[PDB]
Amino acid sequence: SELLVNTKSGKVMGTRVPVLSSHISAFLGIPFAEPPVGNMRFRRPEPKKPWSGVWNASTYPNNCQQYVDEQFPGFSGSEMWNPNREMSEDCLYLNIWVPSPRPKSTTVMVWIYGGGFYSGSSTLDVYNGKYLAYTEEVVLVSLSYRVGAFGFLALHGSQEAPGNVGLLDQRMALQWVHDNIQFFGGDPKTVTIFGESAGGASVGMHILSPGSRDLFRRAILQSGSPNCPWASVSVAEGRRRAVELGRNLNCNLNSDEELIHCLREKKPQELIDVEWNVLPFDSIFRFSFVPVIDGEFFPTSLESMLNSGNFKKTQILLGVNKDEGSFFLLYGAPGFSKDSESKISREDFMSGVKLSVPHANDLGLDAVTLQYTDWMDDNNGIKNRDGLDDIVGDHNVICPLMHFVNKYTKFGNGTYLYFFNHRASNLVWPEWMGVIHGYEIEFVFGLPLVKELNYTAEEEALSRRIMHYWATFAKTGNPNESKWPLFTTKEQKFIDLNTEPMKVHQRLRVQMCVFWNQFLPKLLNAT
């Protein structure tokens, strides 16, 4: 009955939320997995036992335990990303914004949030799909998943805490969407999973994982790709970090079971407090507990898969933002400050390069510095600042994405690549950070539409263009209904996603990414 929907899991009483000039069905907080609390901490998610009686889906679910970000208290730019509901381990709940009148079967769009796998909320304001579902007649469901140790602690040997558990949560979220989205008016065979940062990497880790390939149709990866430095760790590394976290919380590391038992006893916060104490190297854009390459979720090294074309062949719309690294420097690189032009000195530029490329040996750092240094002005504060904004940007998000796009394109059924180079006129972050990683979302989610958030009309336009590109793609598999070029390994066309007339370019940051994806690693292996 419009708001009340019956599903295989049970009847769910949604709510009618106002959107733009109208209203929309919104089913918030539908469980999709049994609360991963208790002795299930780290353990894979069990499906949600069918409930009875309408499940009140009118209020946003809790947010998984995650590292809040107090780096700029009350500062929107940072707070807008912090869990905005009571954190709880009992957070595995999905949200569904369904057009009104409820479609009979329309495109479904599942959103997987970002936050380098250590943070993330499906309830964030910029993730409110009410405008996307409405403006684009699409059924948008944003899932949630265990982030941090809680969902990614990878003591490989054990089953009590195998890795990628939080990656499984997404699969469970996707499975439920597959089985019940029809009851919401969603076409289960036209489910496009989109995500940014870690989400754009998770989405991609589903295109690879055999287990997930069937639970969705297409994929939109924003500022992310599974093959990212920060997005994965070997089973061993994850084990290491698992015992290290254990060490930090002072656990009996004599065995996976004793360790796990110990960890299962620590309050959520005990883990979140010391969870950064386990990175193996002083760095930037690196997170502790991140998807482990287990051989179960991921059959082999994402590169071996990407190489052998061992992945779901479909059409993917992926892209990156002009300034991917700015946010990570400003937070973990010296010399950058929210309130200053952050004109990084040379002595600090090299401190930047150390943090950006934590694996690089001296020669590595040397090669990186050689590529990013002006040499005809090797002291320019600005040049050094922007240089790092690229070392971190290219190295962490652009280059691995250009790899995945290229390796995937030689097998997938179409690739559409964009380059979002637009600093939201109403941004609150420093102008130097430029087009920040994670700031295209508010556009993808049609925020410019709401006048209260006051974006220039020109941006509302961009928003609608972006949302249509997304929606039209989720439906047809092509962003087009001028023409957004297909990405082909031969020509490598991609487009700028800004308020200016959508221009076409070729070979995103090619000179750099060749060094990043071809030379640097080759150097590092030799030296």
Residues in the chain: 527
Q: Does 225 bind Hg ion (CB under 5 A)?
A: yes
Of 23 and 507, nearer to a copy of itself (C-beta) is 507
Measured distance CA(174)–CA(195) in Å, rounded: 13
Report which DSSP code applies to 102: P
Which position among 9, 197, 342, 356 bears the catalytic label?
A: 197
Q: Does 453 bind a copy of itself (CB under 8 A)?
A: no
Number of other CB atoms surrounding residue 380 within 10 Å: 18
193 neighbors 219 (Cβ within 8 angstroms): yes
Instruction: Extract long-range pairs of 371-378: CB within 8 Å, 24+ residues apart.
Output: 371/512, 371/515, 373/349, 378/346
Report which DSSP code applies to 45: P
**3-state DSSP call for residue 280?**
coil
Closest CA to 411 of 253, 208, 239: 208
Measured distance CA(514)–CA(69) in Å, rounded: 34
Q: What angle do CA 295, 311, 160 make, to 5 degrees?
A: 25
Among 353, 367, 462, 486, binds a copy of itself (CB under 8 A): 367
Q: Does 106 bind Hg ion (CB under 5 A)?
A: no
263 neighbors 271 (Cβ within 8 angstroms): yes
* Shortest reach from residue 136's CB to Hg ion, in Å: 5
Q: Catalytic residue at 324?
A: yes
Which parts of 155-229 are beta strand (E)? 186-196, 218-222
Of 265 and 377, nearer to a copy of itself (C-beta) is 377
Which position among 89, 136, 244, 324 bears the catalytic label?
A: 324
* Shortest reach from residue 219's CB to Hg ion, in Å: 12
Of 150 and 515, nearer to a copy of itself (C-beta) is 515
Stretch that binds a copy of itself, among 166-174, 238-246, 340-348, 359-367 (CB under 8 A): 359-367
Q: Catalytic residue at 257?
A: no
* Shortest reach from residue 353's CB to a copy of itself, in Å: 14
Of 313 and 522, nearer to a copy of itself (C-beta) is 522
Q: Does 224 bind Hg ion (CB under 5 A)?
A: yes
* Shortest reach from residue 361's CB to a copy of itself, in Å: 8
* Shortest reach from residue 320's CB to Hg ion, in Å: 9
Which string of x and - marks every residue 452-471 that binds Hg ion (by CB under 5 A)? ----------------x---
Of 52 and 376, nearer to a copy of itself (C-beta) is 376
First to last CA, the chain: 66
Among 366, 421, 460, 476, binds a copy of itself (CB under 8 A): 366
Phi, psi of 448 (to 5 degrees): -50, -20
Of 127 and 515, nearer to a copy of itself (C-beta) is 515
Stretch that binds a copy of itself, among 49-57, 322-330, 365-373, 412-420 (CB under 8 A): 365-373
Residue labelled with tokens 């989205």:
181
Q: Catalytic residue at 156?
A: no
Q: Does 346 bind a copy of itself (CB under 8 A)?
A: no
Residue list 490-519, contact with a copy of itself (CB under 8 A) = 506-507, 510-511, 514-515, 518-519
Say which residues have a Cβ less than 8 Å from residue 461's Cβ, sequence separation at least 6. Answer: 499
Measured distance CA(524)–CA(520) in Å, rounded: 6
Residues identified as active-site: 197, 324, 437
Give me the residues that bind Hg ion (CB under 5 A), please: 201, 224-225, 228, 400, 468
